[PDB]
Amino acid sequence: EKLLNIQPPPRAQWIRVLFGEITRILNHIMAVTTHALDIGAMTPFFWMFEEREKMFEFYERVSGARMHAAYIRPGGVHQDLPLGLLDDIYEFSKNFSLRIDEVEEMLTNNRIWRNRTVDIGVVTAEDALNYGFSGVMLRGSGIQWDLRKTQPYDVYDQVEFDVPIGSRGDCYDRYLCRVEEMRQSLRIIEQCLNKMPPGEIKVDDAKVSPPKRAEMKTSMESLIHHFKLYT
Amino acid sequence: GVQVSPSGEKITHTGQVYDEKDYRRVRFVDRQKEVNENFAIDLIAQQPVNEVEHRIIACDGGGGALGHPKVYINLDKETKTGTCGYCGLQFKQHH
Amino acid sequence: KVKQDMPPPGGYGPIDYKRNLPRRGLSGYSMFAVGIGALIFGYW
Amino acid sequence: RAEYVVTKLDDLINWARRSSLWPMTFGLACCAVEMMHMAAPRYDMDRFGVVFRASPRQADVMIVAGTLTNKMAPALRKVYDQMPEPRYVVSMGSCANGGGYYHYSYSVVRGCDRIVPVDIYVPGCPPTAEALLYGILQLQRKIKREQKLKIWYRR
Amino acid sequence: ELVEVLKRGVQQVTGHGGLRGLLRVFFRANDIRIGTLVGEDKYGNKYYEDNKQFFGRHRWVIYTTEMNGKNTFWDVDGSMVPPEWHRWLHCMTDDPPTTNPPTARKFIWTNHKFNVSATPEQYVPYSTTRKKIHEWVPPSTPYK
Amino acid sequence: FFINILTLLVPILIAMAFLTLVERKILGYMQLRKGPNIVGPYGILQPFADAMKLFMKEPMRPLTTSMSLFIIAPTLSLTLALSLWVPLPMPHPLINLNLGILFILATSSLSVYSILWSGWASNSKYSLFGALRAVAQTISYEVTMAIILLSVLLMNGSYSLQTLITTQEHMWLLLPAWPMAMMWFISTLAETNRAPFDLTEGESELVSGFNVEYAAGPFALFFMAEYTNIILMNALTTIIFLGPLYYINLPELYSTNFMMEALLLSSTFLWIRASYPRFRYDQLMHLLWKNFLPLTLALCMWHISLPIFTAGVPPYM
Amino acid sequence: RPTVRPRSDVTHKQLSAFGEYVAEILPKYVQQVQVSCLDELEICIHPDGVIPTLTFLRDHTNAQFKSLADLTAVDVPTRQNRFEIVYNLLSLRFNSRIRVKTYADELTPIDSIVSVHIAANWYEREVWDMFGVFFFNHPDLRRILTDYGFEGHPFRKDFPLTGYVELRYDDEVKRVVAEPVELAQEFRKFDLNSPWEAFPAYRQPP
Amino acid sequence: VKPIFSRDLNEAKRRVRELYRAWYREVPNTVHLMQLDITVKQGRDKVREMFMKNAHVTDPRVVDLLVIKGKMELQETIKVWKQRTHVMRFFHETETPRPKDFLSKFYMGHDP
Amino acid sequence: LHHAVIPHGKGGRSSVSGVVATVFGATGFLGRYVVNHLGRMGSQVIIPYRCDVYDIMHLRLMGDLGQLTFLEWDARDKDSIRKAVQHSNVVINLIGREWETRNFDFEDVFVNIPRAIAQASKEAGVERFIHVSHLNASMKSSSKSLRSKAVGEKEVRSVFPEAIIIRPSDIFGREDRFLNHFANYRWFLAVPLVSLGFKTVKQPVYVADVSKGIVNATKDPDAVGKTFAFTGPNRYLLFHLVKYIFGMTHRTFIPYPLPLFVYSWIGKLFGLSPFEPWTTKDKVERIHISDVMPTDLPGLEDLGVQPTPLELKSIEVLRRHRTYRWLSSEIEETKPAKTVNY
Amino acid sequence: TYKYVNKKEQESEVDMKSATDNAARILMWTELIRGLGMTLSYLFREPATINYPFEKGPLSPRFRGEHALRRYPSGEERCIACKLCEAICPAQAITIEAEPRADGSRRTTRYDIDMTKCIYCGFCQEACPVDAIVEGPNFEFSTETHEELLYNKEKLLNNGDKWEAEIAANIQADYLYR
Amino acid sequence: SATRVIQKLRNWASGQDLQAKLQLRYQEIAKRTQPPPKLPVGPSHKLSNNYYCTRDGRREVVPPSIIMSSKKAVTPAPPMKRWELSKDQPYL
């Protein structure tokens, strides 16, 4: 859409930011709990993969697949939300922060995880920028950089949230940065469900997004742009 | 109508059959070759012709956005059943 | 009339995202006074 | 009657292998997440008694998940050859079935059928965790309905 | 309330059709739970719904004893359910075919063939095309 | 006597098989799974089928291994794990040793010898890593564990095992000796390789440790020995520290109380397995020689001084 | 206009001034400066230019392009030097991105940036395995992403998409063996280039 | 043209002979340590045949890049990174070679 | 030819060779090597299997998509032979059992089963019939298996005149009953040999060379009706053969001189196991046999592949019996067996 | 807006009550007792598993599964040989070589759907202008041999004939969304 | 759900309330069947004053502006400021 110089609609931008932070919760939860499986805490993987199955059901409600969705098309998203998905997103978002509190109740403040993960893999910030580290690898070491805050793509300048940065560069600080990024992802979830705008889902340029299915059967130019946008 | 070969093979409705000396029939022993009973050629002869008063009819296959696009069929030649090329429901002028 | 997927009027409710951890157990002096006092009756 | 005793001993020796079969803590793909989702407690392995051991000497069934590249091919055949002799292979997903994407790539072996025998092809890019939990039900009934001591008897 | 949940356990023990029905549900489903019967299909599945359980646990089945001339006591799989009840069981709709039936068309199958791999009933693939290169046959008579 | 051998050795095998069943069910209910529901009435026929799968699968005869130690380590491992039960007290033991605590200590190290011979003669680099972290794990646990058993048998003056229940008739030894009890439970987790202190079986840093090349058969018989050691040291902690009320008119009431207490202790063991993350071979040795060995040397000091301060000199029998 | 993405000219004029500054500071050693639409600045330099231009962009006070994003060849076979080796930089202070291009073929290499950017220590191995572009002064330059014996750098346009080597297990040698490739179904290549002029401003002269 | 590390053909042949020296030291440790199947004389003959496959070229640029490729195969066979099957892929014992005479190439297919 | 049996291809996996072979007895060792070399060139092979699907499961990789049709079969029922033969154009017959069962004797599995397979082949009109026998088949052999195989050759010539009777010697391969039978003698810590190997002499012949020769016999147009004596490489005496096997294994080599009557008694009371036995009396009298040098009979070199020797490929197949002490010993660290000319 | 996650290291004059609180956090491991209480709270729950051969999964009406050819409501196979469904199928898994039917209409001779290929993405069911190809919500179609997941035309047609009672209800409940 | 004794044990052992917030969906998920919604028009679904020659984004992009091919200090932007501490949580 940048190469075609095409803006999506604001409903497409906010559903992109909303499901990108569902995606951020998905990758941070798999990251922390699969790292807990690599350490030896097998149980946050199970207790958080139940919630990951619930968010895969959200993915399957919005697009149709569990993982390989192919939903965020160039020029806005493919289809709409199903009716009453956002109520289930709100009902999951009420109860997920207690699960975050339970997983960091077991794992953050305890001796075993703290002794295994403090002062391990201490990266210098200048050596991290020389090695080309990015995102949570930088935010463990404490250099303040987040692409939703300093170079705002989509509609991420509209939402307001906090950037978790560490102060010692270790495994424990990177895990705490990921857990705090889940909590700030929950804050972006609350802001998206507060200010999701009405509108349409793809771009209304028929040469960029494919046209609607009701207008494809009735209008000829939609059949041309459907045909030569799909072959 | 599902026809039968002299080898007992069901003729597929496109006209595909395997020859009697063919080695590609050996995937069908102790198994079965799938042929549907509802032939798509024979499932249009049961459809009646539609007697309509329009000189140009519009067809969509029923449902609007459910079926095929809304295309327009001429009915001027009364000796020929004016068909819809997506579907095949035969139309005819009332007079 | 459209029937789009929107939040309801009045908005959605508040979402908890801050870290809320309970202060369970008790004070560390009296918890030691339980455990040292468990030794004294046990040794008696 | 001896054939009834032979078939009931065949059912008694196949009941153990259909129930307590022990898979592999594999990886390699997108499809590594859905093996972890069959481990996850919605559609569950361990309700059937399907346990992710890590060792190939202790494994009983191999869930090949996703892409099997040209570098991964001796790293798959070496592991399957060091599985002990009841060896069943599930192929999760379309890249282990016949190369779902990357069929025409330079560095994907075009399915897991080129290297090992695969006893059940479970399709999808997600096989959902219930869909190859159906796949472990169908391998479970497949090596229920296999006859080992019966064709040991009539031989 | 502990005697109320013990009465719940006694009720779900005594509600599944006597001791033989209790033992066949206990050794087929391996879950003894009772709900209302939302519909019996043409093959013999007994469909149950209990909305006090979870979203996902609330709709369940008890399968057939016979299906297409096969003993299905301990051999139960995924694709035994009819397609008209598939939408109800996998929570794609809130309407069973007892309440809201689907549209019936004249070409549709009146019996569900189940998933049929490693059976004499089996899909095997083939070309669905004719012979594109027609050969030249020799003549039946010689040159002289 | 052989009737007592068979009716003590068969139902301990049924008990450890059901311990593996309640491991899978208790870790399942901890992890929001249901556990192995589909086979048996509620799971009961799963570990019988696990033995009947793993013993009707074949083992390897690898080229790289040494075959004599390959076949002589797991026969040892099942013999020592089933032979630590024979000095265990119950009401009245199958065999009453004169000094059985040293038998428990030495033959519990000989189980690690079976693990260590598996690690060397399995002849992988992974198996050699597992053998040397068995060495480092016993470097961590053994001196600490014998100082704990010494410093509690300064309250019960002999090494006999019936003397523990005639000492613990009136009260448990949890209440005078809870700094002994917490570090003994941690040290017997380090003994029997459970998921906080499980290295050497590994499964999350290396592949299998002592049973990398050990296929079904000998891996199953190691698995038999390992969970026999789990229920064994659960019952040993149960008899030595939270030893129940002992009535000479009613030994079966005390045996039922001991078995409710031992299933509580085994649920605590699997609860600790599904509650804590896993140690390291450096930090394991580090805190079991840093945060344990001065504390258990001071507890050895205090229980040396305890027949002098409060003048309880223990009797011989 | 909600369809078109809005254009701010302030980033285009400050990138024009900064590209003028980099072409001013390196006149021997910068060939082309392109401040494109979508507001990205591309600086195309010599094959000898890469070490001091990237040392300038890493260590200069106004530049501060410390983090390297990616090292990437593209293979255009209609040039004399086929591989455009690009280096994407990133300012951690000034919030911008230089796309440095340089040209190469397979026979004139580039000095590698491992001596200044240790981010690219795996990116050099990636592009040497991927395109056949050798780099100087590397610690251990190695083919990593193709096989141990995959003869042929695959991302060149002269390489086919299917490849040359397929693998198959053979019971004859009891190992996985390589074969010359043949396919069950061919790659059905399409001709999706429409014959009409798509963009009238992007037209080549005849 | 700006050259790679070998300036001329004599220095390029010197580095070629140094790489052949390292392969000739490399082969018996590979056959002894990989649990290999081939004769060590067969391995040295295959190294000589793979050199004579590429030894019809003049340019020191492509000779030095073949030295770079052979050093990569050298370090992947010294440090045990090329396996038994990856070493044995060079022999191609699953496939008879295509017939050089015209008549069997006429018979076996449409090959020019 | 037909419109799909024509060989448009390049001789690989997805290529078509048109060699539609029903490989009877493909489940074992010679069958797994010839189904490998048949699907290497690329064909739809037809595999009738008598055992479970699990012991034939490792054959599923041996060709392209849908190129291996596994049909179960019983040896008594003629319809099971008929439905596997009747769509083919070449039938390979590798029916072999070196021991006896209760349902199948030494003679019926080599006479009456190739009688029924060639009778269904002559009823179905396939072109070539690659029946494999032993080259020591006569009427006066001491073992019963060669006496069964000679009259099986007589009856298969009676019911099939254009039948290619390929006659290998003792085939050696990775899972064989020759090399592993000679190298599993280390558990008894002695090799009881028949007259110390001084009156018997053998030619071990490689299984890929036999399978490549069977594939070239199916593809050879002028080889129909022949009788291929299929002995290849250099001729070894048995004392030097077991000396080569045990010197390459580097185990203890004490050859026990035991006579033929007592060692056949050892085989007779050793073959009573209800599983697959370690040795049998006809296996013992096939060890005590001399494979003669064949006169005017064609073999490997006129069919199109050269026989690989035992010294070139013995490290492929004898590596499964060594210890770790001498695991990495290559070809040159052992002494080759002495080659005799008689 | 940034936020620190681990920055509390300061000598803040730790007194007797907070020092005994830290020295009772260590040497009793009461936060490990807290983690034990967390797992004790989770063991007393009715678990989240379903018993899948008798209690099947939660899904969606848009859940794309097994490929199927639909049919019109009055007979007549819906596929009209457009060939835009293999120009959109990114695995190149569809061969649909066709002819005139010698009845005046337009159908296909061959369909091929490769289930050992293909991406399960719904590109074809969004490119089909008549909705002939559809992705009916099966997931219980795992086969044992590699032949049986090469769906040509007849398996696809009786698949859609098998599943037309559910697919048409999904399209009738879903066609306002797309 | 379980009864009150197990509910109070779960609430004490977690440390907070657990019947208010469940990870198990009982009735918090709405009805899976739905009324059919109406997809709205876009800002280019106009009958009048709607041209692709004014609405295009694919043809307003030109070839790239070549500056130099063959004054004070210049920065690629204003130099960015560090962010502020969060008012909800400064530390953790």
Ligand SMILES: NC(=O)C1=CN([C@@H]2O[C@H](COP(=O)(O)OP(=O)(O)OC[C@H]3O[C@@H](n4cnc5c(N)ncnc54)[C@H](OP(=O)(O)O)[C@@H]3O)[C@@H](O)[C@H]2O)C=CC1
């Ligand atoms: N040691 C050797 O390998 C030698 C073999 N030969 C000859 O080579 C040929 C094949 O040898 P090889 O592969 O090693 O032999 P195997 O022991 O491996 O068995 C060959 C095949 O015969 C089948 N078979 C055996 N008995 C019966 C029966 N009663 N009914 C149906 N099928 C049966 C087996 O199937 P199933 O799995 O069901 O048993 C198997 O597939 C034979 O003609 C043999 O005489 C000659 C010299 C040496």
Ligand code: SF4
């Ligand atoms: S089968 Fe699909 S989901 Fe699995 S690895 Fe391949 S592309 Fe990813």
Ligand code: SF4
């Ligand atoms: S787009 Fe639809 S109707 Fe057209 S060829 Fe494909 S499946 Fe058939």
Ligand code: SF4
């Ligand atoms: S779902 Fe996607 S992958 Fe499958 S047929 Fe349709 S276009 Fe191909």
Ligand SMILES: [Zn+2]
């Ligand atoms: Zn119509």
